[PDB]
Amino acid sequence: LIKENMRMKVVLEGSVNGHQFKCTGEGEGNPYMGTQTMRIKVIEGGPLPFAFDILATSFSRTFIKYPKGIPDFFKQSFPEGFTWERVTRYEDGGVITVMQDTSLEDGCLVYHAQVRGVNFPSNGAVMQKKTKGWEPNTEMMYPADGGLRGYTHMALKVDGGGHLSCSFVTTYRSKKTVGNIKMPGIHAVSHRLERLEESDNEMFVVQREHAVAKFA
Structure with missing residues (x-):
């Protein structure tokens, strides 16, 4: 179900420091190479009175390059998919x-x-x-x-x-109701999230991520 070329679309909404907003994105990538690009628009609440960087890590775990020998929890979760909570x-x-x-x-x-x-x-x-x-x-x-x-x-x-340091735990959960998931062992994922384009008041942002799974 997860092809070598996949598209994605996103709706992201909420508030920061009481400022309400909504963003929509669409993109594509190669899930098996761990690469993706997304074009994002602030469609409500813009211009945002805060750094878009704080939202940037909330816009894609299907696109991680996993070696043979570390099971890929996210790709295996389809068709139903998964949730994450951070x-x-x-x-x-x-x-x-x-x-x-x-x-x-x-x-x-x-x-x-x-x-x-x-x-x-x-x-x-x-x-x-x-x-x-x-x-x-x-x-x-x-x-x-x-x-x-x-x-x-x-x-x-x-x-x-x-720099400002930040930490988080993310809880990733499968939605699968029929079928199996082979669980990986402890491992790591290396991330590079790059801003490629932005408009003046960050009302339009293009970003890309490269994520590769490795042994810990």
Whole structure:
């Protein structure tokens, strides 16, 4: 069901520091090479009064390059797909909670994400739009009662050479109601999320990710 070329579409909605918004995206990638690109529009609430970087990691686990010898939980979850649930905590006080659903409809991956961010300091880099993308990172993946827990410590780059550290656990759960899933062992996933394009007030963003599974 997961072909060498797959398309995806996404709706992402919620609020950060009380500011309500909605974004829509579409893209494509090669799930077996771990590559994808997505074009994203802010369709409600724009221009956002915060860095889009905080939303960027919420827009795609089907596109990880897994070796033969590490079972691929996400690809095996289809046709039904999977969900993920995350709480991201930032060094300077912001917390963002995300719930995501991943499905497959008529050959296309479809994503719905609900986001709620609070307590980002008003004078901090997020709310002042002084960030400059994510450092590449490695997500540890742990098997947990028929799902996976991912654990990431990520650094958001900020103007003037700083970074904001953030951490999170992600809970990945299968939606499969018929069929089997071969569970992997502990492993890691290397991520590079790159901003390719943006409009002036980040109302339009193109980003790409490269994700590769490796032994831990």
